[PDB]
Design a binder for this molecule. Sequence first.
Ligand code: STI
Ligand code: STI
Ligand code: KWD
Ligand code: KWD
Lengths: 264, 256
Amino acid sequence: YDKWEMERTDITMKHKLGGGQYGEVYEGVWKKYSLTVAVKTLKVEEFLKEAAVMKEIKHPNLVQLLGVCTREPPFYIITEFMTYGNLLDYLRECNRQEVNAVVLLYMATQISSAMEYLEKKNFIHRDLAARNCLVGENHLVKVADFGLSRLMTGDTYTAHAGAKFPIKWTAPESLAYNKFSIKSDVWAFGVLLWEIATYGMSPYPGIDLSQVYELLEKDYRMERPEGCPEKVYELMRACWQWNPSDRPSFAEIHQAFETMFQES
Amino acid sequence: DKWEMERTDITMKHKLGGGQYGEVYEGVWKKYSLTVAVKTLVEEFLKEAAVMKEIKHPNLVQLLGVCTREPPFYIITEFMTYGNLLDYLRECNRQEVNAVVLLYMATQISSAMEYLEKKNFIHRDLAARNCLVGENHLVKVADFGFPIKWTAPESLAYNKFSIKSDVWAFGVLLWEIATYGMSPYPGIDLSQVYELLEKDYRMERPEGCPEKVYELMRACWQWNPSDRPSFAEIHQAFETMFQESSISDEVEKELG
Ligand SMILES: Cc1ccc(NC(=O)c2ccc(CN3CCN(C)CC3)cc2)cc1Nc1nccc(-c2cccnc2)n1
Ligand SMILES: Cc1ccc(NC(=O)c2ccc(CN3CCN(C)CC3)cc2)cc1Nc1nccc(-c2cccnc2)n1
Ligand SMILES: N#CCC(=O)Nc1nc(-c2ccc(Cl)c(Cl)c2)cs1
Ligand SMILES: N#CCC(=O)Nc1nc(-c2ccc(Cl)c(Cl)c2)cs1
């Protein structure tokens, strides 16, 4: 038992979070601080592996591990809870006069800050998308990883290379040679930018999944969304360079957003 | 008991706040050279003193001593540097008292109310005019002594007051905070509020009010008292929002 271990009686377990939307994840209360928390429970090696990964990740714009319960079953991974839930549904339901262009810019900047951190620490996300981000009060955004390919139904994830892929977020080299890297995260980030700019539309709208790889390899790219600033679209296109090594680093992306934000 | 002190331990100065609080005066607790507030004057007075000996919380006005042997009687509390919350909202600089501070103030009040809920006390007059402000936007709930606009439906129709009617009033207090101290139900004839509430009219979201704050307002204004959240739930939602807003505020400063 290490410094992250917490007594199970420190947490009030309330109910499954989102009625099963996230699997075996419960809304709870960290009683001594009056804080709502999220608690992932084991219905085993992968579970503890996820916990060990999260002990190494500490950044304002990444989901923060608060504690674990590993003394007897069921095992717990406890994180902060984010008031407004996932970013995709938030964008689709928000007041767009309230969540306006400067807020969208602010959300993109925080996500690039989180990815710059993972880049610095040699992590790969592998499933970056709006559905894996969370929104808090005062336009806080945190990047998470809910393990959604198992949980979500529909066409978002589809069978490919004997696995489940979000085809429309997946970099070419990952689709073709099953190669994943920080640069394939940059590609997905470009798609996430487009999700943000369209307030959560599905990417390549109206284009069948069967066409996506061929179109990309023949240099098709999504058009600039209505109202999207040209400089932001330039960034999207740099994220979608066919050669991973031609894509910018997250350090460069965040610097560019930083400059843009203070000029607003 | 420990609370009894002599009337001569305290130098009584002029009445406080133009008497708007009644017979409450600025005083000085001599032994500590400390400015204090002193309420002076049936046995309601002594009931209030007895209650305040049972209350201790960061965001509830702190009793310091009592004089309950021979008239005139004293209830002595700490003195709060910045006066009552309603005037503070109405006169403040909104660039300094911004959305992060308004959230901090609501969080502090919900914590005081969770504490009263846990002790089985009922406030019965929660409103911004009954809160006090100290340094660093510290807020404490007090009770100075119907306000139809703050009064829950079952209190209006049946004279039933409970912690859940305090929850209703807290929702109205949130709206006071969110509007920097506007009067609730703008322009609406107070004599028609009960029937309006019965037919599911509620105040609209104020300009700039966060959506989860308004959702909590509307939960506080559920018609059935059992459908309203507890103050433990409300306080938990606000501490959770407040931590998010503090992190974001730091991220935004770091960008500049
Ligand atoms: C309760 C929990 C347990 C574990 C996690 N894990 C992560 O979010 C996560 C994030 C990043 C990594 C980093 N990782 C390294 C590289 N690899 C390839 C994958 C990514 C790992 C796990 C989140 C949570 N939190 C969680 N889960 C589901 C829903 C919610 C939730 C929902 C609504 C509102 N607030 C919170 N919150
Ligand atoms: C000097 C005093 C005497 C008594 C009280 N009493 C209370 O503030 C109080 C608060 C809560 C309860 C709890 N009670 C539970 C039961 N229900 C029905 C009523 C509430 C009782 C009294 C406050 C004060 N303090 C007070 N009163 C008026 C003005 C000021 C004041 C004004 C400006 C600056 N600094 C201080 N300060
Ligand atoms: N309705 C509608 C569509 C619309 O107005 N789209 C917009 N998108 C933005 C925007 C600004 C900065 C970033 Cl970083 C991003 Cl991703 C998007 C500005 S307006
Ligand atoms: N124009 C105008 C006034 C205005 O901007 N009003 C606002 N209210 C909020 C707010 C934030 C947190 C809480 Cl808890 C509450 Cl009650 C309100 C933020 S901005």
